[PDB]
Amino acid sequence: TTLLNPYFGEFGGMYVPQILMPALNQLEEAFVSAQKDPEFQAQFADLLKNYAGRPTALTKCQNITAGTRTTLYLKREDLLHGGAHKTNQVLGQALLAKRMGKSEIIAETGAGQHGVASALASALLGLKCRIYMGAKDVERQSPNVFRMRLMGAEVIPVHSGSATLKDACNEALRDWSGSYETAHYMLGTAAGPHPYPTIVREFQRMIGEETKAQILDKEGRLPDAVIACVGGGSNAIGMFADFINDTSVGLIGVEPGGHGIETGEHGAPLKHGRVGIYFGMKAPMMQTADGQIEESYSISAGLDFPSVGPQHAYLNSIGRADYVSITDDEALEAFKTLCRHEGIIPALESSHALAHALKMMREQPEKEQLLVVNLSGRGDKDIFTVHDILKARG
Amino acid sequence: TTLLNPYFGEFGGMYVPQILMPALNQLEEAFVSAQKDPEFQAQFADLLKNYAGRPTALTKCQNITAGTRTTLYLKREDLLHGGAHKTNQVLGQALLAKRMGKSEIIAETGAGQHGVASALASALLGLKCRIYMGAKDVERQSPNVFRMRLMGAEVIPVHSGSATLKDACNEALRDWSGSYETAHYMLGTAAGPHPYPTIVREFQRMIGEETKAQILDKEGRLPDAVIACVGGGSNAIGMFADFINDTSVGLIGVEPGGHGIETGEHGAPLKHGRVGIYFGMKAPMMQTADGQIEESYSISAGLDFPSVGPQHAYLNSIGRADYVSITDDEALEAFKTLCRHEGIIPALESSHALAHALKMMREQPEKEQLLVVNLSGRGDKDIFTVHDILKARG
Amino acid sequence: MERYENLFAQLNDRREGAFVPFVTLGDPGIEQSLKIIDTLIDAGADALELGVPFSDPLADGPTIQNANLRAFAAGVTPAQCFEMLALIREKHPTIPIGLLMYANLVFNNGIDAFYARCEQVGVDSVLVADVPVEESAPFRQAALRHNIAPIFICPPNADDDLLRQVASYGRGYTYLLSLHHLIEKLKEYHAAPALQGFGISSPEQVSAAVRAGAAGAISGSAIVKIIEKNLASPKQMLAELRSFVSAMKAASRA
Amino acid sequence: MERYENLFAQLNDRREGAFVPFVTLGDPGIEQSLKIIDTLIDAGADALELGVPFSDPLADGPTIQNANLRAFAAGVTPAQCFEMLALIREKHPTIPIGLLMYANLVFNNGIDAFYARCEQVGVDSVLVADVPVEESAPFRQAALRHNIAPIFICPPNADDDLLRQVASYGRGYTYLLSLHHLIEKLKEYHAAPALQGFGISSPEQVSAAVRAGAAGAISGSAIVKIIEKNLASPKQMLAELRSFVSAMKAASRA
Ligand SMILES: O=P(O)(O)OC[C@@H](O)[C@@H](O)c1c[nH]c2ccccc12
Ligand SMILES: O=P(O)(O)OC[C@@H](O)[C@@H](O)c1c[nH]c2ccccc12
Ligand SMILES: *Cc1c(COP(=O)(O)O)cnc(C)c1O
Ligand SMILES: *Cc1c(COP(=O)(O)O)cnc(C)c1O
Ligand code: NA
Numbered sequence A, B: 001t002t003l004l005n006p007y008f009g010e011f012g013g014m015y016v017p018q019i020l021m022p023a024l025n026q027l028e029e030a031f032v033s034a035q036k037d038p039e040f041q042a043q044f045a046d047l048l049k050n051y052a053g054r055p056t057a058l059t060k061c062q063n064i065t066a067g068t069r070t071t072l073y074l075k076r077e078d079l080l081h082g083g084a085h086k087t088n089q090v091l092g093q094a095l096l097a098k099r100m101g102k103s104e105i106i107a108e109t110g111a112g113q114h115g116v117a118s119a120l121a122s123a124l125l126g127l128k129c130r131i132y133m134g135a136k137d138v139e140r141q142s143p144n145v146f147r148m149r150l151m152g153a154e155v156i157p158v159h160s161g162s163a164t165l166k167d168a169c170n171e172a173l174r175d176w177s178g179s180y181e182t183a184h185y186m187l188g189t190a191a192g193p194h195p196y197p198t199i200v201r202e203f204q205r206m207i208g209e210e211t212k213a214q215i216l217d218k219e220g221r222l223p224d225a226v227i228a229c230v231g232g233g234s235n236a237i238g239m240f241a242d243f244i245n246d247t248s249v250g251l252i253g254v255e256p257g258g259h260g261i262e263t264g265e266h267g268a269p270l271k272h273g274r275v276g277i278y279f280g281m282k283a284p285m286m287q288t289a290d291g292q293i294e295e296s297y298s299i300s301a302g303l304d305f306p307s308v309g310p311q312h313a314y315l316n317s318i319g320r321a322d323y324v325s326i327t328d329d330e331a332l333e334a335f336k337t338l339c340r341h342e343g344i345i346p347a348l349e350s351s352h353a354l355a356h357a358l359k360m361m362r363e364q365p366e367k368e369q370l371l372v373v374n375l376s377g378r379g380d381k382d383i384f385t386v387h388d389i390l391k392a393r394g
Numbered sequence C, D: 001m002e003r004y005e006n007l008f009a010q011l012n013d014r015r016e017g018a019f020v021p022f023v024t025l026g027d028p029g030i031e032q033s034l035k036i037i038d039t040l041i042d043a044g045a046d047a048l049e050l051g052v053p054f055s056d057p058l059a060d061g062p063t064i065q066n067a068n069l070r071a072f073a074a075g076v077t078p079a080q081c082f083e084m085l086a087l088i089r090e091k092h093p094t095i096p097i098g099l100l101m102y103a104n105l106v107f108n109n110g111i112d113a114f115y116a117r118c119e120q121v122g123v124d125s126v127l128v129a130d131v132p133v134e135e136s137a138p139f140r141q142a143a144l145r146h147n148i149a150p151i152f153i154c155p156p157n158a159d160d161d162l163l164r165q166v167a168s169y170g171r172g173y174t175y176l177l178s179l180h181h182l183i184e185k186l187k188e189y190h191a192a193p194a195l196q197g198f199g200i201s202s203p204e205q206v207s208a209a210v211r212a213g214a215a216g217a218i219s220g221s222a223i224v225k226i227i228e229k230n231l232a233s234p235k236q237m238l239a240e241l242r243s244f245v246s247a248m249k250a251a252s253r254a
């Protein structure tokens, strides 16, 4: 049994080897305890405010929307310590680890943002951090690898399988199986086995809570829609959660369309994959006809999780949230537009969300609409990527 | 005549060609007007809060100080939009430009942080921005050059002289001489001719104002000392200003000692240069025995201004503030220490300030003291520099 | 199921433990794998545990991980694995054959269809490595509908509630992860006979397991290492596999 | 000062304007510079404006910037410049010599010492390019103590208060930046005679300046370009300088 429901409709569960179940039950128990504990909440709040820089701004983008009836705000998770929303929940998870008496952290990372986040939280809170990263990603992400090491984390390359994120995810679990008595597995998105999708949402939900307060203050009403990119689902569910019961608020998740859905080179399992069981959960995934798991492709390394959080699959199924996709070229155009018109360099991940808002505006420019885009991270990291592409085209 | 005093004791003034005087008087006039105008203050406040992310956190660093009687807070200007304090005053100066009816911005930059800041402010506020940068600096700072261009700024390499910051400063003035009717010169530090040292201080003084409020809230008293690095003087004077009349608060400015003062390869004109007249002001500078202006050396490109703001020279002369220096190796050690112990990657500029606080602590570990270090920027930009050095030594 | 029942009854009449090798199907290729398996049986294997190569085997150690990679280098698919299984069964009518599966390969084209295919080729049991008892209902139900034993792992961190569930839900054999009391409790609850697995690489461990009250022992990495170490000489490979299995089986005998 | 007074009185008796070339001392080297200067004088220069190479000349255009760089490539220092000045004076006792300075080179070893050195070598005037009238007191005072004319720039954006200050503070000549009314107002306020400067590169501009009521014209970039263009042939350089100065001076004559 469990304290909380491990499922969102058909999606989710705890598909791990039997040996890992006690670790998951322990964690669920500690989480439920922590959530009722005012001292935990105070400590987490203090870190978020005084270390991470919460609350983040809600910025009105008036240049971008000129000549249309769209009003567009950006939730500024790019201003969070570390440059992405990932910081919020690593702080919560690190505090949980300490509550359980754990001294060590295991994390997985792809593009490296979650790894840097895990390493910084571990440094602050006196935890011994080790990070698994697919060798292909280690090669592509020397800057982030070096940041992790400066912060005292041990970075472990993964050569098994495709030597990318899914393989790091596998190796992270392999390790925790044997070390969960003293180590906590700091999963990096709102996916994997229960209780992780729930924990990650609850430790990101301040995004949406702040957005609601801020939009009510500035506009006196709720948004028509809130829009967020979806790699594994953490920034999106953090934005969405507080608005789920506000039936008038649209919830729009944006998956990477890569070179185009029809090309097969994309990262949009929720809308174009097939339900499977992997990484501890039942959820839509990128997989062969035979059931082997495949990679997600995107211009943005950060949208490479080959599945999606089960709560998104559920919200889609019931029609509460809508999911769409944005191609590499659309994301690139949104990146360039934000830089030039607002002086904000967005992460290429977040640029997917922005691109869809830009489409909503441009497609129907006399439609009155109030939109909030979750700007999940800053794009300083993507300057070289964008440079080279723009150079390769001239 | 002028509305405000152009001098801080012997230091400062308006040493520009006669043709530039009307531009300076105009600017002074507009500034004095703007400072009494509640609509200007409201607009500047709104940008600072909702676009830039003010107020910035004041973070207590408990791991760093363990086993000593030092309590150390960091003022988190690294969390400001753009990653450095430079953003504060470019927003103010851009608003002034618009108040004067100017449509164009000229800026100078060295390491490139001020250029990026000028470009982002100009993008936001619909100004046409052109930036002068010494060819040697353009070569060294491709990432920042590319950021400026993504934000729509025109970047102009300067090949005259040493082709570094002082030469960009010269070319920026050359241009404004001829275009001041429609262009504002957005000077990047608390130096140059009046009214710039005054304007820059006043548009950075929220750093110290917030610090005071925050330290009173958290500790119930003022700091024993506030500590800031000094390239040209803007972050330091922004921290210091609100504490000048608080006689119990030490004000400590840290210049770059480079390879060591005795080597001559440093950037510490205030304490080791000689008073001269250049860049519109009378101030301590790096100069030959003959009076030719020389370059400042530091591991940190951002501390390369070969002079210092006149208000610092004045505060030193009267004994209100004390100035010290920190070497490349001391700054590097402080950089590494902050990353590992607090999970914050500091700019190498700011690492000089931190290093001196670390010395105050370590030298006298049973001295009870409450210190605030202005963390003027984030150090993501310095990862490659620090990597290569650490690689070259093994 | 029935093949396990018959085996354990036969082995109990001879006061004998089971020795059960694990290999990955199609490692290092289809043909060499079929030969490997025939050699394991000829050398005295009492039953077989057979892995179907999966892209992301998060319960497999490095040795097994590399077996999967070799199998994938050879283009081995689940479809080819089921063709292999049919032939192994056609050659060897009584030896119990168990599969070591990952959930996605079972769930992929329908849980029911998967177990129906197992029944068609003559598989006796299926251990789904990433399905704990808590998630097992549809798997164990489908297995029983097609006369397939659902195998559960009884790990070290196992409490009494889990022992009771494993005893009630499992059939064929109980996979006892590497224990005298665990073994007694499983017997008390009428669990399927225990096979000890994980780190079994020497004859004395087989005798130890039988002495502790287990019905036998499973060995994988040890076997797969012999494959890994002899890829350049397929003939040497079979010889060394024969030697190892024969020694391990001898340790099970009264 | 006195040399300018004498010149302007002499030129006024001949209904004649002054033509005043500017060059950078030591461009392209000390020797070639001394020859250049002697050629300018022989060709009919009425006075000289002479730049001391400075590291950061923020009022100099590209042509002049490059002259400074050539002078620095030759190792030219302010000390060497003052040695050059003494010799030029020793050769040419009546020609007014003005310096174009930047503030730091004047302030460096003491404002008083600088003007005392000017007086010792026989300099007549000093224009400090980055010292506006507002900052000029110590400079103009020291200049007058050593019988040196302090020169002020009267720019286009000049209002009546500035005209009055320039008239009152300046001596020798007024540098009139490139104007009939400005010229009348300066005369009304008893200003030092106006020399028009900036962009003067052709004979007709010299005649125009004199016609407008100016006492003459200054030309720099035009002269320095001839140096820049002929670095490879020092002999050709002098010839072309002679031709240009002679033409410009001829345009000043009644
Ligand atoms: O390799 P070993 O240590 O001898 O253990 C057998 C084990 O590998 C085999 O039974 C097996 C292969 N994959 C698995 C997944 C889960 C449980 C067991 C297994
Ligand atoms: O070069 P031109 O356009 O002919 O102008 C003479 C000018 O260069 C010379 O008088 C001069 C050289 N440097 C200066 C600085 C300020 C004023 C004037 C000057
Ligand atoms: C990792 C990352 C993402 C994608 O992960 P989610 O869990 O879907 O949020 C999006 N934006 C940024 C900036 C990231 O770093
Ligand atoms: C430019 C810069 C400095 C130095 O300039 P000041 O005017 O002295 O503040 C210091 N820190 C950062 C992060 C900078 O970008
Ligand atoms: Na995904």
Ligand code: NA
Binding pocket: B230, B231, B232, B267, B268, B269, B296, B303, B304, B305, B306, B307, B308
């Ligand atoms: Na300096």
